[PDB]
Amino acid sequence: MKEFYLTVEQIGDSIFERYIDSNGRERTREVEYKPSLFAHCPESQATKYFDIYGKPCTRKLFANMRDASQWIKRMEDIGLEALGMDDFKLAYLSDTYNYEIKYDHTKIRVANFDIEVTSPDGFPEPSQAKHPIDAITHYDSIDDRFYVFDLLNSPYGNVEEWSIEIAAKLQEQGGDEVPSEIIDKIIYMPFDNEKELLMEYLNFWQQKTPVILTGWNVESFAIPYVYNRIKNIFGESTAKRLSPHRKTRVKVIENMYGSREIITLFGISVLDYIDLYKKFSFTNQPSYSLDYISEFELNVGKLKYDGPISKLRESNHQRYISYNIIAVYRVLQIDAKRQFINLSLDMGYYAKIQIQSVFSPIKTWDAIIFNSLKEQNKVIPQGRSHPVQPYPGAFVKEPIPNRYKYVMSFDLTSLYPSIIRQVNISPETIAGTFKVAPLHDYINAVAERPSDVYSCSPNGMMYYKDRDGVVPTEITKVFNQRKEHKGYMLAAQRNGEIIKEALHNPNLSVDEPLDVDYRFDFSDEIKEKIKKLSAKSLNEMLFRAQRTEVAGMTAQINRKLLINSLAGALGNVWFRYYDLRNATAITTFGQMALQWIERKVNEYLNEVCGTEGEAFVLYGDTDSIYVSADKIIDKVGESKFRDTNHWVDFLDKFARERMEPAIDRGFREMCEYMNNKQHLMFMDREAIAGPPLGSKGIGGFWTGKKRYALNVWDMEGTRYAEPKLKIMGLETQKSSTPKAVQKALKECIRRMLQEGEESLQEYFKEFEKEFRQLNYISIASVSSANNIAKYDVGGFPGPKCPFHIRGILTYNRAIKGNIDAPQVVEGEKVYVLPLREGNPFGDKCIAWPSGTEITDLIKDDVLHWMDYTVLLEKTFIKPLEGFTSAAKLDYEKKASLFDMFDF
DNA sequence: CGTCGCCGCCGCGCGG
DNA sequence: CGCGCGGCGGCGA
Ligand SMILES: Nc1ccn([C@H]2C[C@H](O)[C@@H](COP(=O)(O)OP(=O)(O)OP(=O)(O)O)O2)c(=O)n1
Ligand SMILES: [Ca+2]
Ligand SMILES: [Ca+2]
Ligand SMILES: [Ca+2]
Numbered sequence: 042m043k044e045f046y047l048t049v050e051q052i053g054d055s056i057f058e059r060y061i062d063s064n065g066r067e068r069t070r071e072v073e074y075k076p077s078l079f080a081h082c083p084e085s086q087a088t089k090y091f092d093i094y095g096k097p098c099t100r101k102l103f104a105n106m107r108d109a110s111q112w113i114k115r116m117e118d119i120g121l122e123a124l125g126m127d128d129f130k131l132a133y134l135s136d137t138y139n140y141e142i143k144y145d146h147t148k149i150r151v152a153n154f155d156i157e158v159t160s161p162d163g164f165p166e167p168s169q170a171k172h173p174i175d176a177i178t179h180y181d182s183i184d185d186r187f188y189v190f191d192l193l194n195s196p197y198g199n200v201e202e203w204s205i206e207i208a209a210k211l212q213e214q215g216g217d218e219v220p221s222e223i224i225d226k227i228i229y230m231p232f233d234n235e236k237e238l239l240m241e242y243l244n245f246w247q248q249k250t251p252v253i254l255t256g257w258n259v260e261s262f263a264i265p266y267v268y269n270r271i272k273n274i275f276g277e278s279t280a281k282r283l284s285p286h287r288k289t290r291v292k293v294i295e296n297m298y299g300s301r302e303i304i305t306l307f308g309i310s311v312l313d314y315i316d317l318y319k320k321f322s323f324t325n326q327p328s329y330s331l332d333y334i335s336e337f338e339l340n341v342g343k344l345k346y347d348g349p350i351s352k353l354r355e356s357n358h359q360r361y362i363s364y365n366i367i368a369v370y371r372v373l374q375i376d377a378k379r380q381f382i383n384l385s386l387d388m389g390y391y392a393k394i395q396i397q398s399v400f401s402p403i404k405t406w407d408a409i410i411f412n413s414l415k416e417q418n419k420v421i422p423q424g425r426s427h428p429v430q431p432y433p434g435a436f437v438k439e440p441i442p443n444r445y446k447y448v449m450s451f452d453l454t455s456l457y458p459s460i461i462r463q464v465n466i467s468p469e470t471i472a473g474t475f476k477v478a479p480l481h482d483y484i485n486a487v488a489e490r491p492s493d494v495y496s497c498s499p500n501g502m503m504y505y506k507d508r509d510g511v512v513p514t515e516i517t518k519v520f521n522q523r524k525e526h527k528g529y530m531l532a533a534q535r536n537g538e539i540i541k542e543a544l545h546n547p548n549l550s551v552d553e554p555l556d557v558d559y560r561f562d563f564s565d566e567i568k569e570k571i572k573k574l575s576a577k578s579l580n581e582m583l584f585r586a587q588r589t590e591v592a593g594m595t596a597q598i599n600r601k602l603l604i605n606s607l608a609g610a611l612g613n614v615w616f617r618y619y620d621l622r623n624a625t626a627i628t629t630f631g632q633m634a635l636q637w638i639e640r641k642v643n644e645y646l647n648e649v650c651g652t653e654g655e656a657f658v659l660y661g662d663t664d665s666i667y668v669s670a671d672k673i674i675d676k677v678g679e680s681k682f683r684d685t686n687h688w689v690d691f692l693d694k695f696a697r698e699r700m701e702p703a704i705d706r707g708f709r710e711m712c713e714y715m716n717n718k719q720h721l722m723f724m725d726r727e728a729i730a731g732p733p734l735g736s737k738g739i740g741g742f743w744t745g746k747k748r749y750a751l752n753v754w755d756m757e758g759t760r761y762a763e764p765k766l767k768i769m770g771l772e773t774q775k776s777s778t779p780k781a782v783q784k785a786l787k788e789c790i791r792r793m794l795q796e797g798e799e800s801l802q803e804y805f806k807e808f809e810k811e812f813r814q815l816n817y818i819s820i821a822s823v824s825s826a827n828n829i830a831k832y833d834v835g836g837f838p839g840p841k842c843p844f845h846i847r848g849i850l851t852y853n854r855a856i857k858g859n860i861d862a863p864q865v866v867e868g869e870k871v872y873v874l875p876l877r878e879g880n881p882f883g884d885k886c887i888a889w890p891s892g893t894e895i896t897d898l899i900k901d902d903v904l905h906w907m908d909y910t911v912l913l914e915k916t917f918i919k920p921l922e923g924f925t926s927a928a929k930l931d932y933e934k935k936a937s938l939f940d941m942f943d944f
Numbered sequence: 945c946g947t948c949g950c951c952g953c954c955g956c957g958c959g960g
Numbered sequence: 961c962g963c964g965c966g967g968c969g970g971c972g973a
């Protein structure tokens with residue numbers, strides 16, 4: 042096989058590399074790497090090295106890496122550019138793997154661990170590590186085993202050995218319900234004392250050194266606790282055995298709310314799963330405890346136990362160990378579904394970076410662009426210093442607040458990356474500038490043509506047309522990858538709806554699910570067989586369809602994130618290729634393109650309908666337009682349609698056969714006007730929305746910019762078995778809105794769009810009646826706990842104190858001087874509740890850490906002094922009033938002359 | 945060390 | 961709670 046790296050580090054003048062050799066053996070080597078950097082040289086001296094502008098460069102080969110660094114400093118003192126890759130490990134990887142990396146994940150050691158630390162005096166601070174480590178479960182991906190290190194004797198209690206037999210048993214048999222599929226994979230090791238536990242763990246680690254190290258909060262907790270505890274017991278040299286090169290760095294993260302210290306283990310790539318989840322899941326969660334994320338992702342119930350975790354080991358050691366094993370497995374299960382490790386390894390090897398650098402698109406693109414340029418013997422420019430400067434972004438149209446019955450949306454494929462490709466925006470393709478006219482003059486095609494030679498954006502920039510820049514070239518490759526995976530995702534989605542349809546008529550038999558590839562549209566043979574399957578098999582197929590879909594979603598959306606981050610990076614001062622002319626060229630073009638096509642679409646439909654001045658486009662944001670289809674439906678008449686699916690086919694055909702060709706023509710003209718290199722403005726139909734035929738539903742509504750709801754029947758080719766609510770921006774989509782309120786507001790919207798005014802008033806009335814029975818967590822608001830100290834004036838709210846911060850301070854006073862109580866962590870999330878006047882807490886609100894039941898100390902008083910009326914008004918009624926007034930509805934029945942005839 | 949646009953809640957200081 | 965500005969948090973793109 043072709044060799045690939047595992048990890049790479051620079052230590053002084055050595056490169057330390059772990060890698061997989063041509064036989065699939067893990068190896069390590071130390072190389073005295075001789076780096077090269079570059080200087081501009083006279084036009085009249087032979088060289089094969091040129092900077093990106095075509096200026097000749099001389100290569101300077103250095104005796105060692107320190108010399109190279111010191112030369113960079115001298116070139117600064119002199120005032121001349123030091124060109125080339127100044128991150129020497131990236132240049133090493135590029136020299137060593139001068140080919141597309143083919144990696145074998147089965148040779149990479151992925152380690153997933155969690156630790157337990159009993160602590161009576163509150164949270165066990167990793168930097169202190171003053172409490173014994175009493176459990177480690179370490180899963181190894183190569184052995185496929187859960188190694189459990191269990192401490193039997195501790196100053197906090199002596200316990201009996203854990204029992205795998207009891208752990209396997211159902212909770213109803215008194216067992217711990219450890220999933221049977223891993224029971225055979227557990228290697229259990231009990232220990233008489235902590236010292237031997239840690240010594241054996243270190244020896245284990247040495248034999249089975251993690252390449253990728255993951256888990257839940259391992260970066261902020263497990264890793265530093267283990268490192269510091271070993272350090273405190275044995276000394277630094279022993280702690281440093283966690284690094285395969287015996288080098289660690291104790292270094293803080295420079296934030297704006299305080300400071301926390303993480304431990305950098307040279308020769309390991311730490312991918313804390315929480316950080317992977319936060320960057321790649323496209324969620325914002327009320328809580329980031331593993332219980333909460335597990336239940337969301339997997340639908341598994343919380344781990345239930347009695348008393349505080351600080352007493353769990355001594356009261357129930359059996360469960361303590363089992364829950365530690367289960368926590369590890371749960372991360373693996375989340376990964377089996379989301380596939381973030383896979384994504385990371387894919388991006389990492391593609392860019393040729395340290396795997397942990399996937400968190401940094403700037404580092405990712407810097408390496409991609411450097412490898413691409415190096416292939417042509419080109420030299421990257423030195424990074425420069427820039428002041429942070431604001432710049433303009435996308436265009437958003439002000440919608441007329443209203444209900445909208447029939448709506449077709451259109452959307453541009455990868456807008457910003459397509460603009461980069463269409464215009465040829467790259468650092469080395471800049472050709473000059475033209476005299477800009479006001480934007481609406483380009484929008485309305487009255488401005489003079491920018492250039493007869495170069496490719497332009499309405500911000501004034503011109504670009505070469507003879508050859509593609511490295512930014513367009515490289516953004517295209519990843520764009521193309523994205524498209525493949527999106528194709529897989531959409532097909533899995535369409536396949537899911539076929540299974541849903543079949544579930545309405547399940548057969549009564551014993552059978553198996555079909556062995557099919559869910560990434561491809563089902564054949565007719567597969568479709569027929571599905572129609573003959575039981576509910577059990579169809580459900581299992583649906584589960585697999587939905588899993589295939591999620592896999593495609595991870596792969597496609599994060600590739601989209603990466604390419605959109607390149608466009609963004611152009612506006613970040615730390616990007617080597619930072620240039621505001623280029624960032625603005627993208628965003629201004631976008632503003633033009635959206636408003637241009639609004640004008641064209643209107644002009645087209647006005648002509649089609651025989652009118653003048655009618656606004657068919659009701660809304661637009663960045664790259665999408667929303668078109669009123671009322672008149673189109675009306676031109677044939679509703680009475681001519683058999684059912685909903687009929688008008689949906691009607692609009693699907695109108696959008697694809699009439700609108701898209703006109704939209705294409707409009708953009709082709711814009712490309713010529715701007716003289717662009719390639720026409721890549723592809724606007725396809727996205728959504729078809731409307732009320733169920735024969736119903737009183739309103740179909741959709743907007744309340745303002747970025748706030749709207751639609752009843753969707755078809756979304757980019759997927760015909761739903763059941764209509765789907767597309768809701769953007771409204772309170773149902775916000776993590777800050779109480780769970781029960783999101784649910785209830787959603788049903789109100791469902792009722793408005795699908796059923797009408799009368800059904801809406803039925804639901805509201807009932808919800809207002811029963812509201813007070815709701816569980817307090819389901820009705821608590823959520824917020825982030827930022828800058829608590831800033832607004833803490835001796836335990837009481839300072840000036841301008843935010844509502845949620847007040848709640849935290851109320852909380853802090855109520856738990857004051859209790860070590861056992863959960864502390865609110867700066868920057869983490871809190872549940873928030875209003876309090877009725879005259880409550881013992883002495884303030885109007887209280888906040889506690891999210892994902893948790895509030896400490897038993899104050900729970901009773903919170904539930905008794907909870908202000909339901911305020912709660913109902915603030916989070917439910919006000920947003921609903923917002924929806925209904927925008928939609929011209931009433932949530933409460935207005936009095937009529939019909940009152941009353943019952944007498 | 946990917947980006948900007950813009951929403952609603954809140955405290956504040958009005959607003960004769 | 962009528963009004964706007966600035967802090968904030970958070971979402972849409
Ligand atoms: N995080 C993001 C998301 C969006 N945008 C910009 C770039 C996008 O091109 C444009 C529209 O975003 P979309 O959500 O519509 O997605 P794309 O058009 O990029 O891709 P696609 O529509 O094919 O999924 O907005 C951005 O700058 N940063
Ligand atoms: Ca735990
Ligand atoms: Ca788009
Ligand atoms: Ca699309």
Ligand SMILES: [Ca+2]
Binds near residue numbers: 543546548572574
């Ligand atoms: Ca059937």
Ligand SMILES: [Ca+2]
Binds near residue numbers: 452664665
């Ligand atoms: Ca869009």
